[PDB]
Structure formats: structure tokens, C-alpha cells
């Protein structure tokens, strides 16, 4: 369709207006004194949130060129959310500052591509300085502090996440879900707890608990689904001779086979319980093999070659303790070689490295947490659904920040790390004067997060920024107490990955945006 | 950062038809040294037709890679079992490409590896295939996503002749997509 074309200062001014609309909607949330933004949702009640990426996602402007600017700067928050899961507001603030200073420079007639090159050079040097300035975050106290800061100073969230990480461990997986109660609950399950229940209710050994409890049972792992008792009959007879209980993991047990298993269950010849295998095609086999390695068994499949009529007790897996309920099956202390478990975990890690999808990688990490380490679920407690959404967003932020902190370390929060980095980069120079000006606008933009935090507290951003710059090291301004001190000592820690990612994404988008001379869009 | 990835020689985007073919678990890939290259234009489901070829390969002892439309069912299962049992290190992969392209690429692999493609149109049958019929390569890496053939044992002059034929087709070729595929 017919296009509206704008050039030079007019297009840049409209782009800046759109960026400013989005950034003003977002930056009111930055910092502890930051406020909440209500996002009208077509379906459901309005969402109240203190996250830059959600506000940015909702922003869309009537003016086409302003909307272009808003979408472009919205990519910053989206990318920051995708990479680090936190820092989206700091990233939007950084992008706005870079855009404002760079557009000022363009209005001064300097070459925008050289400004972009200066910004890129300053940001590369800044990333190196952040890595140098970063300190490891391995203790639980620092992890709790990081979670508390990322949860808008909610000490409970930080301590809960620290406890969860301490329990499940490094290979452990932690997920955040809604809770029925008003209080945050931490649920940690170790070993295999795949979500498959008993195929027949009558398998329940303990009625008062409504669950099957097996003591030192054999484990049969069949890749196929069965409906006849003939093929497993040697295995059942061998188990009955042994006398120990048996657990069946298979694609499906039904009809005559299932009925025979149930009858033998009451009759007492064999304590047998059968559940469905976890997952689906091309993943069911993987989870079956992980269970086999954990329990020291072998999977019965047609592809592998073995048949169930020829299966033996040695073929069957071994575990210390088993709990079957309606929703999930739990295996405790599977009798399997440790070295095999670590080898299988290493193979799954290699596939994770090969994996390029978030869903795939999270499923493999869940498998790893099933084999070794544990899995934790944080049930967010809130009185209402709007509070539930807000608190869940904050807890997810805290979890992402804690993972980033463990991965790459911590730096002083409150925008202090960027201030120190910019101070260390005062001597950085480019190939020409325009690149030098780009470096300077990047350095000045590095002060934007601290200034916006101070502004959200109602204080004077320039005075606080000057005081912080006059300090050295980790000295900063705690916005929650309106006091100055060592950011590390007061527990205001920012993951190095979060700060670095915010700076990088804001710099890339803003540097490209300042290089624009023409804008083409549909007419109104 | 900008990354440069250069793959040399034949490396089509076909993975192993069965995960259990993996000789090296820590890498999750099959590494066959000096293996025969069986190139079948038809699909495979029964082991009877390749059985002479498998017995010959076994008697020799070198591994066998089966590039065919699809190896599944009984044939795939027996190949996998024989893979663990150690009589013959056998890996089977799907033929690269589709209609008309797949044939041509099979023939290029045959020229590179000095083998012959087993097809009904050509006339030969797999029951009558011999070791001389099978191709040869110095090394073959099979992974889940792609197959790589290193130093296929084939006459150089034949490779240049086949390349010249494809060049002629490229010259005649007008469509951008087709030209890129031949390139």
C-alpha cells in the first residue's frame, strides 16, 4: 500500500518520540522505588506488572513512525528477556539514553555510522570491564541477595530460591508455578519422579495413602505396549520365584495382561504394579534408557533386538524403593552403577550443547535433573490472581537472575557497575572524532540506570550520580534506604550476565537506530 | 561474532536411521574407518536381498555404510543387532535429496567412492551385488543431523568427468534454485 516517507530530522524526531513513549512507560518500574504498570488485556482482568519486557510488549502507537521507534526499542527488552530473563527495564533505559545522546550527536552533524562504531567499541570494552569487575556468586547468601534484589527486595523469594538451588543443586531444575495457598511453597523431589500413575487402581498396596509402596522391587522396562500375559510370563515366573515386588514401565499395559497382573497382585504370588512410560515418541525411549541406567536394567525393545520371553532377572532393573500414586511414579535409590549414570548425564549434556531450542534444552535439563540432582517447584502464594501474576513475574525474574549470577557472577547493583565501567573507559578512543563522540554517548548512557533508579525514588539523579562517581569500587547508593554504602555489603547485587546483556542489546539496537535517515511506513 | 564453517568433501544432511549405530558414545556419532559404501536407489525393508552383501562385508571385516531411500523394519533391526554383536560394523542412512536429485547425488557419491548404485532401472539387483560393486572411502562420520564421507576411494578422472557433466547442466540450467543445487 501507499507509503509515507520521512527523512532526516523529522523521521528521527518521530522515532525518538515513539522510543520515549515506550521507555517512559517502562522506566517507571526500574528500581526498588519503581512503580507498577497496568496493561489492559482483551481477555481477563488487567495485568499489573513491574517488568519492562511486558510493558514494552504492550506498547503500540497510533503514529506510524513513532510506532516504528517503539517497536525498534521494544526489541531491546524482548532480547534482554530472552537472554537473561531480567534487566529488561535497565536495557530499555540504556537504549533510550543511547538513542537520545546519539540523535543529539547526529543533530550536531557527526556521521551516524561512526557514532555507531564508537558505541560498539565502548560497549565491547565495557563488556570486558564487566567481566573483569565481576566476582563469583557461589555462596547461598549472595544467591539469596541476588534473588531478593531481582524480586523487588522480597527477601522471602530470595531465600526460597537459595534453598531450592542448595537442594536440587547445580544440575537441579527449578520451575515456578501457581500455588493454592497464600504462602510461597518449595517442593523438591529427588531421583526419578516421572508423571505417570498406576495403570490399575487395585495395585495400591497401602489404601490409607492411596498409593503403591514397593520394597526393593525389580524394574521391567519394555519399549513396546502389551496386552497379553504370554510374553512377560517367564519374567513374572522368575519374579515370583525371587519373591520381590515388580514395577513395569511400558508404553501401555491393558486388557488381559493388566488384568492378570492385578489378579496376581491380590493373590500375593507377585507384588506387581504397572505404569505408563514417560514422555512420547523419540523421547519415551530416552527416558526409558535413563531409568535403565539409574536402576541398572535394560530396556526391552524390538529395535534393540531382545524379546520379553527371553528377559531374565539380570535383565530386569533394580531399585531400593518405589512409590506409585495416581499422578506420578517415584523411584528411590535405583541400584545402578554410578559411572554409567555420569556417562549418561554427560551424553545428555552434549545433546543440550547441540540443542538449539528452548523447549528441547529444558526437557533435556529436566531429564538430567531426574537422573542426578533434583527438581524443585516454587508455588507462588497470593490472595488474588492479579497478585499471583505480579508475584510470579517477580519470582521468575529472581530465578533467572540467580541462574545468571551462578553462571557469570555478580557486580554492584543500582547501576553502579555500569558507572564504574564507564569511569574505567574514559580514556577509550576511536578512529575519528565521531567515533569518540559515540564512545562518550555510550559512557554517558551507562549512567542512565542509576539516574533512573534515583529519579524513581524522587531524589536528584545528577547529585546521586555525581556522588557515586566520586566513590570507588563497589560504593553506590542504596535506593531502598536512600543511603550510600558498599553495594555488595548491603546485598544489592546484579548478575554480570544481566548487566552485560542489557548493555549489549540496548547498544546494538540504539546504534542501528541512530543511523537512520529515512523511514518508510504505511500511510495513516 | 561471525563464524566460518567449512566442510570439505561429501557431507549430505542425512543422519543415522537408528541411534544404536553409534560407535563412539561420547561424541554421539559413528566413525567408520575404511568402510564399504553400499549405494541402493531403492528402499530396504527385508534383510534377504542385502544378505550376500552383508556376508561378503563380514568375511572382509570392513564396516558397511548403506545409503538408501530408507532402511527400516526387519532389515534395520538385524543391522543394529549385528552392529552390537560385532560381526560387522554396519551403519545405514537415508539417501540425500528426493526425486531425480537423490539419484544424481547417489551417483556422485558412487563416483567419489568408486562404487555403483543398485537400482531397478539400471538393471542390477542387490542379491547379486559384490564387494567390487560396493564403494570405498577412507573414513565415514555419521551423526544425527548429517553424514560426512572423507577421502572416497574413486578415480580422479571420473570425478572430473562427472563434475564437467554437472557444469554443463548448470550452464543449461536457468532457474536460480536448480543452479544453486547443482553448484
Amino acid at each position: 500500500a501507499a507509503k509515507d516517507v520521512k527523512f532526516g530530522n523529522d523521521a528521527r524526531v518521530k522515532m525518538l518520540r515513539g522510543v520515549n513513549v515506550l521507555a517512559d512507560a517502562v522506566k517507571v518500574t526500574l528500581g526498588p522505588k519503581g512503580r507498577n504498570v497496568v496493561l489492559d488485556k482483551s481477555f481477563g482482568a488487567p495485568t499489573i506488572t513491574k517488568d519492562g519486557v511486558s510493558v514494552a510488549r504492550e506498547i503500540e502507537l497510533e503514529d506510524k513512525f513513532e510506532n516504528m521507534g517503539a517497536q525498534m526499542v521494544k526489541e531491546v527488552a524482548s532480547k534482554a528477556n530472552d537472554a537473561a530473563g531480567d534487566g529488561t527495564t535497565t536495557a530499555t533505559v540504556l537504549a533510550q539514553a543511547i538513542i537520545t545522546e546519539g540523535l543529539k550527536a547526529v543533530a550536531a552533524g557527526m556521521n551516524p555510522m561512526d557514532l555507531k562504531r564508537g558505541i560498539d567499541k565502548a560497549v565491547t570494552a565495557a563488556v570486558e570491564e564487566l567481566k573483569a569487575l565481576s566476582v563469583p556468586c557461589s555462596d547461598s547468601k549472595a544467591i539469596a541477595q541476588v534473588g531478593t534484589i531481582s524480586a523487588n527486595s522480597d527477601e522471602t523469594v530470595g531465600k526460597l530460591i537459595a534453598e531450592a538451588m542448595d537442594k536440587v543443586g547445580k544440575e537441579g531444575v527449578i520451575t515456578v508455578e501457581d500455588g493454592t495457598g497464600l504462602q510461597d511453597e518449595l517442593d523438591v523431589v529427588e531421583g526419578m519422579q516421572f508423571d505417570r500413575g498406576y495403570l490399575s487402581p487395585y495395585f495400591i498396596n497401602k489404601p490409607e495413602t492411596g498409593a503403591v509402596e514397593l520394597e526393593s522391587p525389580f524394574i521391567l522396562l519394555a519399549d513396546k505396549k502389551i496386552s497379553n500375559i504370554r510374553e512377560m510370563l517367564p519374567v513374572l515366573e522368575a519374579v515370583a520365584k525371587a519373591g520381590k515386588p515388580l514395577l513395569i514401565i511400558a508404553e501401555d499395559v491393558e486388557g488381559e495382561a493388566l488384568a492378570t497382573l492385578v489378579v496376581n497382585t491380590m493373590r500375593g504370588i507377585v507384588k506387581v504394579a504397572a505404569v505408563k512410560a514417560p514422555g512420547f515418541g523419540d523421547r519415551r525411549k530416552a527416558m526409558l534408557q535413563d531409568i535403565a541406567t539409574l536402576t541398572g536394567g535394560t530396556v526391552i525393545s524390538e529395535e534393540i533386538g531382545m524379546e520379553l520371553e527371553k528377559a531374565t532377572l539380570e535383565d530386569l532393573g533394580q531399585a531400593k524403593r518405589v512409590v506409585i500414586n495416581k499422578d506420578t511414579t517415584t523411584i528411590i535409590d535405583g541400584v545402578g552403577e554410578e559411572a554409567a549414570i555420569q556417562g549418561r548425564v554427560a551424553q545428555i549434556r552434549q545433546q543440550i550443547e547441540e540443542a538449539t531450542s528452548d523447549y528441547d534444552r529444558e526437557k533435556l535439563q529436566e531429564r538430567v535433573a531426574k537422573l542426578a540432582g533434583g527438581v524443585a517447584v516454587i508455588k507462588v502464594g497470593a490472595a488474588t490472581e492479579v497478585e499471583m501474576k505480579e508475584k510470579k513475574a517477580r519470582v521468575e525474574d529472581a530465578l533467572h537472575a540467580t541462574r545468571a549470577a551462578v553462571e557469570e557472577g555478580v557486580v554492584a547493583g543500582g547501576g553502579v557497575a555500569l558507572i564504574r565501567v564507564a569511569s574505567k573507559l574514559a580514556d577509550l578512543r576511536g578512529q575519528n572524532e565521531d567515533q569518540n563522540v559515540g564512545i562518550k554517548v555510550a559512557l554517558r548512557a551507562m549512567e542512565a540506570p542509576l539516574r533512573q533508579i534515583v529519579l524513581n525514588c524522587g531524589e536528584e539523579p545528577s547529585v546521586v550520580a555525581n556522588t557515586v562517581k566520586g566513590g570507588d569500587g563497589n560504593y553506590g547508593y542504596n535506593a531502598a534506604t536512600e543511603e550510600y554504602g558498599n553495594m555488595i555489603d548491603m546485598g544489592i547485587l546484579d548478575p554480570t550476565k544481566v548487566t552485560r546483556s542489557a548493555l549489549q542489546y540496548a547498544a546494538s539496537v540504539a546504534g542501528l537506530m541512530i543511523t537512520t535517515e529515512c523511514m518508510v511506513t504505511d500511510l495513516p | 561474532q561471525d563464524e566460518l564453517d567449512v566442510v570439505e568433501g561429501m557431507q549430505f544432511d542425512r543422519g543415522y536411521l537408528s541411534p544404536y549405530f553409534i560407535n563412539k558414545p561420547e561424541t554421539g556419532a559413528v566413525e567408520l574407518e575404511s568402510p564399504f559404501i553400499l549405494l541402493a536407489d531403492k528402499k530396504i525393508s527385508n534383510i534377504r536381498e542385502m544378505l550376500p552383501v552383508l556376508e561378503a562385508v563380514a568375511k572382509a571385516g570392513k564396516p558397511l555404510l548403506i545409503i538408501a531411500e530408507d532402511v527400516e523394519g526387519e532389515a534395520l533391526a538385524t543391522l543394529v543387532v549385528n552392529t552390537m554383536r560385532g560381526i560387522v560394523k554396519v551403519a545405514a542412512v537415508k539417501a540425500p535429496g528426493f526425486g531425480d536429485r537423490r539419484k544424481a547425488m547417489l551417483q556422485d557419491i558412487a563416483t567419489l567412492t568408486g562404487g555403483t548404485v543398485i537400482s531397478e532401472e539400471i538393471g542390477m539387483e542387490l542379491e547379486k551385488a559384490t564387494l567390487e560393486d560396493l564403494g570405498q572411502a577412507k573414513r565415514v562420520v555419521i551423526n544425527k543431523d548429517t553424514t560426512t564421507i572423507i577421502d572416497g576411494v574413486g578415480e580422479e578422472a571420473a570425478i572430473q568427468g562427472r563434475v564437467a557433466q554437472i557444469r554443463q547442466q548448470i550452464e543449461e540450467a536457468t532457474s536460480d534454485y536448480d543452479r544453486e543445487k547443482l553448484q
Binding site: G305 | N46, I47, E55, A58, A77, T78, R85, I87
Partner: protein, 96 residues
């Protein structure tokens, strides 16, 4: 022990060949059920129209190539699967 009647025979099927001539392991449909089996018991003999019972050409302990079909039946003697069939189903005996 179970002995057949008339021209029927009790034969125990041989295990399917796990490996081929060239040592290749056969699995699933490749390892088809063997048509050759040892004779466990032979019936008294077939009854002709005239009323005399003619002895069967099969003897106990000789390998027989049988024809699988409706004529053959599956029965379990002492937890061991045996086939029951007429001498007609037997094609050729395997000697030496």
C-alpha cells in the same frame, strides 16, 4: 508321553536359525519358524477304505520337513510345544 492316532504324528519343531550361513544374525520375521522338526511319536497308521491300518512311512526319531497350516495343531506336553499333524503334511524326511 502322548501318542497320536491313525496317521497323525507328534513332532517337535526345531529352534529357528538365529544366524545365517555367513554368520549374520536374523531377528523378527527374518528368523522364520522352521519347517523341520523331530518326530516324538508316530500314529498306529492310516485306515484305508477296506478297513486295514497301513503303517506310516515316518518313524520315531527322524527329522521331518512339515508343511505348516491348518492341518498342524499346537499342543503343550510337559511345558514343551509340540505339533500334531497328519503324515500327509510331512513332505520329506531329513536323513543324515
Amino acid at each position: 508321553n502322548i501318542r497320536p492316532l491313525h496317521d497323525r504324528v507328534i513332532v517337535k519343531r526345531k529352534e529357528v536359525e538365529t544366524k545365517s550361513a555367513g554368520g549374520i544374525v536374523l531377528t523378527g520375521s527374518a528368523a522364520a519358524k522352521s519347517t523341520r522338526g523331530e518326530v516324538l511319536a508316530v500314529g498306529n497308521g492310516r485306515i484305508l477304505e477296506n478297513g486295514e491300518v497301513k503303517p506310516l512311512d515316518v518313524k520315531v526319531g527322524d527329522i521331518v520337513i512339515f508343511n505348516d497350516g491348518y492341518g498342524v495343531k499346537s499342543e503343550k506336553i510337559d511345558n514343551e510345544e509340540v505339533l500334531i499333524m497328519s503324515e500327509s503334511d510331512i513332505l520329506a524326511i531329513v536323513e543324515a
